[PDB]
Amino acid sequence: FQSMSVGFIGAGQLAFALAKGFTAAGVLAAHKIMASSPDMDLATVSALRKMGVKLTPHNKETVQHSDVLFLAVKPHIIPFILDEIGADIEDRHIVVSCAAGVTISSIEKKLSAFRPAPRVIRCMTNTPVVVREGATVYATGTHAQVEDGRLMEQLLSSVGFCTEVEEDLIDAVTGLSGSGPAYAFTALDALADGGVKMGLPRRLAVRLGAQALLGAAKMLLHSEQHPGQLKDNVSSPGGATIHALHVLESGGFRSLLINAVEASCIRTRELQSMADQ
Amino acid sequence: FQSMSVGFIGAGQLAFALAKGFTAAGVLAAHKIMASSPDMDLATVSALRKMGVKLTPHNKETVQHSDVLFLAVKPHIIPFILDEIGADIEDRHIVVSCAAGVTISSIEKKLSAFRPAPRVIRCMTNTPVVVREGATVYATGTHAQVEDGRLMEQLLSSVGFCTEVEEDLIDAVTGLSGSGPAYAFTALDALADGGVKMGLPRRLAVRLGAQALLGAAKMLLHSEQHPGQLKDNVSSPGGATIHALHVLESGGFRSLLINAVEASCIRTRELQSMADQ
Amino acid sequence: SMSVGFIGAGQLAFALAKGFTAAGVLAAHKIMASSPDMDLATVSALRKMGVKLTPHNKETVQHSDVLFLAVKPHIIPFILDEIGADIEDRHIVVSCAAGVTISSIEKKLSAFRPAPRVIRCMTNTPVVVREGATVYATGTHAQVEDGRLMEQLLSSVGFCTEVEEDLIDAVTGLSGSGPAYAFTALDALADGGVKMGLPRRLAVRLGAQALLGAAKMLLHSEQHPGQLKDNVSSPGGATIHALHVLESGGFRSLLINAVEASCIRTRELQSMADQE
Amino acid sequence: NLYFQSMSVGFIGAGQLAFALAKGFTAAGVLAAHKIMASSPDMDLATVSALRKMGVKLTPHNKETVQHSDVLFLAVKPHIIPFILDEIGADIEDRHIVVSCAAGVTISSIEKKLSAFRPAPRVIRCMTNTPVVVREGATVYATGTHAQVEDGRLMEQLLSSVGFCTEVEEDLIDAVTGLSGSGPAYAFTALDALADGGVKMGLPRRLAVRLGAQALLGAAKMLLHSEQHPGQLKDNVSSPGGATIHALHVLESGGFRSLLINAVEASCIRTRELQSMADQE
Numbered sequence A, B: 001f002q003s004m005s006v007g008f009i010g011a012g013q014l015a016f017a018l019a020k021g022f023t024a025a026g027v028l029a030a031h032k033i034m035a036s037s038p039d040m041d042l043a044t045v046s047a048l049r050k051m052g053v054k055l056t057p058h059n060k061e062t063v064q065h066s067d068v069l070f071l072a073v074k075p076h077i078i079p080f081i082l083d084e085i086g087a088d089i090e091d092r093h094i095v096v097s098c099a100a101g102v103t104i105s106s107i108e109k110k111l112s113a114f115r116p117a118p119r120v121i122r123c124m125t126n127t128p129v130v131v132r133e134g135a136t137v138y139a140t141g142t143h144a145q146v147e148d149g150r151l152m153e154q155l156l157s158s159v160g161f162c163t164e165v166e167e168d169l170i171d172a173v174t175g176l177s178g179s180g181p182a183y184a185f186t187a188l189d190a191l192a193d194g195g196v197k198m199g200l201p202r203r204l205a206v207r208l209g210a211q212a213l214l215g216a217a218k219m220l221l222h223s224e225q226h227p228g229q230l231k232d233n234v235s236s237p238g239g240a241t242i243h244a245l246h247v248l249e250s251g252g253f254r255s256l257l258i259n260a261v262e263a264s265c266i267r268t269r270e271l272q273s274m275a276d277q
Numbered sequence C: 001s002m003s004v005g006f007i008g009a010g011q012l013a014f015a016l017a018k019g020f021t022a023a024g025v026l027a028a029h030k031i032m033a034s035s036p037d038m039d040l041a042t043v044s045a046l047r048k049m050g051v052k053l054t055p056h057n058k059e060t061v062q063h064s065d066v067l068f069l070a071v072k073p074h075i076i077p078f079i080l081d082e083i084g085a086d087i088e089d090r091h092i093v094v095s096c097a098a099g100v101t102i103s104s105i106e107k108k109l110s111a112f113r114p115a116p117r118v119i120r121c122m123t124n125t126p127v128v129v130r131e132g133a134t135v136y137a138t139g140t141h142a143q144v145e146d147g148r149l150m151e152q153l154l155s156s157v158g159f160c161t162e163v164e165e166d167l168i169d170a171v172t173g174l175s176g177s178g179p180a181y182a183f184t185a186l187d188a189l190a191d192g193g194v195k196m197g198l199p200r201r202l203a204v205r206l207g208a209q210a211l212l213g214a215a216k217m218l219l220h221s222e223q224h225p226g227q228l229k230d231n232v233s234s235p236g237g238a239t240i241h242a243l244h245v246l247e248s249g250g251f252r253s254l255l256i257n258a259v260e261a262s263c264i265r266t267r268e269l270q271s272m273a274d275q276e
Numbered sequence D: 001n002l003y004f005q006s007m008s009v010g011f012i013g014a015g016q017l018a019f020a021l022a023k024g025f026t027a028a029g030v031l032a033a034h035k036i037m038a039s040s041p042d043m044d045l046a047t048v049s050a051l052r053k054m055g056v057k058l059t060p061h062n063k064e065t066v067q068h069s070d071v072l073f074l075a076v077k078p079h080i081i082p083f084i085l086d087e088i089g090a091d092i093e094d095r096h097i098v099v100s101c102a103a104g105v106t107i108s109s110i111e112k113k114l115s116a117f118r119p120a121p122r123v124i125r126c127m128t129n130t131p132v133v134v135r136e137g138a139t140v141y142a143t144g145t146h147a148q149v150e151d152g153r154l155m156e157q158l159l160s161s162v163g164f165c166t167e168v169e170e171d172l173i174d175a176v177t178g179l180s181g182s183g184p185a186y187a188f189t190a191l192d193a194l195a196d197g198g199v200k201m202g203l204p205r206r207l208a209v210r211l212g213a214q215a216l217l218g219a220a221k222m223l224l225h226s227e228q229h230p231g232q233l234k235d236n237v238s239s240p241g242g243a244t245i246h247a248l249h250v251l252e253s254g255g256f257r258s259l260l261i262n263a264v265e266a267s268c269i270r271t272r273e274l275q276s277m278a279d280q281e
């Protein structure tokens, strides 16, 4: 909606990325966004203010400003925040938890102590929403209305891919697209190191490697063909590419990426088990 | 230019990718493009014809049609093609070799036997030009005019990144952005396998992993910050991402990507040494 | 009506003769095979089939219309010296030897008669069950009809296609050596079944049937082997867990290593032969 | 000349395995496609479209599949089996043979669910694989408490029309899952890598795929038709000092054999682990 007001409890990296994406998309004017942090001297806080976002140290003011309320504090702080603002949740509120691991059940339990039927949505997104190319999934809670999920999807589709999932997939999504950008940043640093080793200036190597990864990812998104088929399509017999693919295989490249998704997913599950405990 | 006619000797994967990119960009109408192959029954040939590209089995007709002439046959076939069409090169022609490894010197030597001052440009591009997100470098030959390089850059910038380089960087670029898409396809297959292992449907895992890589690459292209800093920015203390980055490091992930760039570059150098020999 | 000869009466002569006779393209007694050692198990098996056996390579040549060279590669030049004067204009000489070039064969035979009809092939032992994988390249003087005849004959015992000669050493590393990679894999898969509680006989049968069915699936599908693997592997399931442990050992790289090592050894041996 | 003229077959679940089995049965000529019904809550699946083109009858309602069928294949994911049994348990009649295809799921668990509605359900548990689609599957089955002797013979007749089929004790089926259930995926991985090897050494990709697949097919057929040990068949390929023995050495140096043992073990153990989780629920 044009009248919709959005708030962020937690004015850090993710609040900045989403606010920048939303305002770049034009789906929200910056003045319709309020964010709160217990430290008005942060870099993200100053960046948000320059964009035109309203800032406050008082989470209650963010709640009173907002229709859609994003929880963008660290997961261990979620229970603290819900106890602080629980009595301020109203019927109009859609509470959107961005925290890794934290279950809809745990959120609904804390909030229902103050007012029955909190409308809760859980999402897992990632930092590339800042360039409107995020990957977002969401699950709807017990009292979320049908239009609540559609509203969520409309908003988050403005900054990237967005689809509804069952909540029990979100920890695995965290391991894949939540942590995914960090795998790519690591890969791009190393690819640039390889370019530099073979004689390219570092700035050109970074640009070429990032462009290669962006273009390849877009090709796969626009293709019906299997990634293995696209692999087959880009390796000439006896050529340079198939020689490089062999050295990746000899190091177990594929297994390392499987290891990574698994380790991030398992850590996410472990953190939440400690929270519930 | 609007009057410019473009030809491809070799109507295979790369000719299709460039022709699709050029026509999607609107910089060339398909009817201004001619491509030739000794087998009019190929899949790429049929795809090119549906787009509106002119096709012929006779390389001489492609030469007579064209102002800009792309050589898109395999590197070992370049010398054969130059001997076949050498007497047909005219003053108006810009000969653009896309072949990995093949030097401007070797091309100019073959063509100068027929007519002095062939205008030659060497490029290294990649398949994502098909979605207008290629990575292209080019080097200008002895008799290339100044406007020849600018024309080249204008044309190839319509389908992705394009910059001029010294020719002695092109074999390293091949190892990085030429082979790069294949590294990404391999990585995306493995990331999807990881998503599937942790419980995601395969189609969703492929979509999320590709979107993660696309978004991360775009973030780096739009950032002044170091990829290591972006890595630092997306890993919370004690969190899922830093746990996954550790298992990548324990397998030497970075070294495998360095190995790959090196192996592709070295194979490219080795193939050309065999050609010159 | 075709008379076929094998110089060499070993494993490949036996496999091809068994395949050809099971296909009904040749009567066993229209095949003649020669070896200097008639006390071999392969010779005893050829004899039981009804194949004609002789110690004299000249007799095999004079009997034959199509002449297969089925001796070890380092024996090929000795054979060509021995019976080169006996090659007639009617002969089609089919070298099965790994690595040995058409050029090397034609150089020897052309010193006797000027236009020897030479075909080079690379096949494999599953011709014995009519599921071989065969490629061939035609020599300088081989007629178009010679290639067509070769393809009809070798298609009776499996897949067969013409290739450029410069691919044959790589084919050797893939489908020539391939059956041995498969036998090794099947032994290990059976060991895995036995470790998890299956009787050996059942584990061997199930593993071999799994491999046969999967290979036939791929041959009958237009889909990529990665997509076929996706149709097996359910999210969180048993197969994707097993695929991970294969990946962690670099399973794919070992098979690439194998094809490469077989191809390179083939090229290296021929390099030695050309030097000598 | 086999044909079950009085047999109606149903599939609960219209996914990969339902398609593969229906394609194999119809290609074998033992069943007409219109005597097969399959149900699924998602009628926009590619597998559903393929079944429709074969002539298979399709419905969203599992009760209709039950009422149509004599032999009822359960072809849903293992964690969905208990929900299915609660849904159509009251619809099971004396005539039904319930054939569970689900990995891990025990006859005991199926019989307990169905027995709450009607005593003596006839249950058979099987483990098959996708190559039934080309009639070269590998299938094992175990008969349940109330299955008649004719039930097992009938199912062996049906499943033998699409590949190898043999009766086993149920305690072997999780290990079979790790070997021939997951087996085709090991083969697809191996064939992709073998083709990568052929391409590295200069072969066109299409030829490399064809040759590698044919090599694996022929070798598997050789072993199935031979009385000799796989090591002896390997000895007939490898000449002294030759190309093959050089390649086998590099496989050995990487522990190739151990990886395939690891795979069978990992798939079997995961199958057991998943069922232990189901029993705890």
Ligand SMILES: NC(=O)C1=CN([C@@H]2O[C@H](COP(=O)(O)OP(=O)(O)OC[C@H]3O[C@@H](n4cnc5c(N)ncnc54)[C@H](O)[C@@H]3O)[C@@H](O)[C@H]2O)C=CC1
Residues within 6 Å of the ligand: A009, A010, A011, A012, A013, A014, A015, A036, A037, A038, A039, A042, A044, A059, A071, A072, A073, A074, A075, A077, A080, A081, A098, A099, A100, A124, A125, A126, A127, A178, B233, B234, B235, B236
């Ligand atoms: N950055 C990422 O890559 C993604 C982050 N997330 C989730 O988003 C949440 C935050 O992520 P980041 O923004 O990276 O953390 P961050 O640490 O950059 O920002 C956290 C913010 O919370 C503020 N804060 C701390 N205590 C507070 C309180 N009592 N009341 C209000 N604000 C308070 C801090 O001052 C800081 O501004 C976490 O739950 C994380 O799981 C999920 C997807 C990806």
Ligand SMILES: NC(=O)C1=CN([C@@H]2O[C@H](COP(=O)(O)OP(=O)(O)OC[C@H]3O[C@@H](n4cnc5c(N)ncnc54)[C@H](O)[C@@H]3O)[C@@H](O)[C@H]2O)C=CC1
Residues within 6 Å of the ligand: A233, A234, A235, A236, B009, B010, B011, B012, B013, B014, B015, B036, B037, B038, B039, B042, B044, B059, B071, B072, B073, B074, B075, B077, B080, B081, B098, B099, B100, B124, B125, B126, B127, B178
């Ligand atoms: N595909 C890629 O990833 C990239 C390819 N390249 C270069 O582009 C060139 C071709 O690449 P692909 O298109 O992938 O090869 P491709 O094999 O798909 O197409 C090659 C084309 O050449 C044709 N051809 C063969 N002999 C010919 C002749 N005598 N006259 C005319 N056409 C003939 C073939 O019929 C085929 O259509 C190579 O030199 C390669 O190094 C460079 C950058 C990346």
Ligand SMILES: NC(=O)C1=CN([C@@H]2O[C@H](COP(=O)(O)OP(=O)(O)OC[C@H]3O[C@@H](n4cnc5c(N)ncnc54)[C@H](O)[C@@H]3O)[C@@H](O)[C@H]2O)C=CC1
Residues within 6 Å of the ligand: C007, C008, C009, C010, C011, C012, C013, C034, C035, C036, C037, C040, C042, C057, C069, C070, C071, C072, C073, C075, C079, C096, C097, C098, C122, C123, C124, C125, C176, D236, D237, D238, D239
């Ligand atoms: N066994 C296989 O898997 C395949 C073999 N080949 C090729 O087939 C040829 C033979 O291979 P195998 O049959 O495996 O070897 P093998 O050693 O089983 O048979 C070789 C035969 O040549 C005979 N021989 C030795 N000196 C002779 C002479 N002077 N005149 C006539 N015969 C003589 C030996 O007695 C022996 O019977 C080799 O060149 C090999 O590269 C190619 C494809 C597959």
Ligand SMILES: NC(=O)C1=CN([C@@H]2O[C@H](COP(=O)(O)OP(=O)(O)OC[C@H]3O[C@@H](n4cnc5c(N)ncnc54)[C@H](O)[C@@H]3O)[C@@H](O)[C@H]2O)C=CC1
Residues within 6 Å of the ligand: C231, C232, C233, C234, D012, D013, D014, D015, D016, D017, D018, D039, D040, D041, D042, D045, D062, D074, D075, D076, D077, D078, D080, D083, D084, D101, D102, D103, D127, D128, D129, D130, D181
């Ligand atoms: N795919 C394989 O390689 C093999 C699979 N199996 C077993 O076969 C069963 C199915 O395997 P796939 O067909 O590969 O799964 P799949 O996921 O392709 O098909 C599953 C089907 O179940 C349907 N479904 C979900 N809930 C349902 C409900 N309440 N009522 C009816 N249908 C419902 C889905 O829509 C889908 O059509 C699993 O239990 C698996 O263990 C066993 C051997 C091999």
Ligand SMILES: O=C(O)C1(C(=O)O)CCC1
Residues within 6 Å of the ligand: A234, A235, A236, A239, A240, A241, A242, B100, B174, B178, B179
């Ligand atoms: O030569 C080629 O086309 C390349 C290959 O190795 O596939 C693409 C970059 C080198």
Ligand SMILES: O=C(O)C1(C(=O)O)CCC1
Residues within 6 Å of the ligand: A100, A174, A178, A179, B234, B235, B236, B239, B240, B241, B242
């Ligand atoms: O909790 C977080 O913010 C994540 C991290 O591990 O950095 C990003 C995805 C999990």
Ligand SMILES: O=C(O)C1(C(=O)O)CCC1
Residues within 6 Å of the ligand: C232, C233, C234, C235, C237, C238, C239, C240, D103, D177, D181, D182
């Ligand atoms: O349950 C299944 O479908 C299997 C899997 O791993 O997905 C195939 C054999 C086990």
Ligand SMILES: O=C(O)C1(C(=O)O)CCC1
Residues within 6 Å of the ligand: C098, C172, C176, C177, D237, D238, D239, D240, D242, D243, D244, D245
């Ligand atoms: O020469 C031979 O017989 C071969 C070997 O490795 O021995 C089989 C394919 C090469």
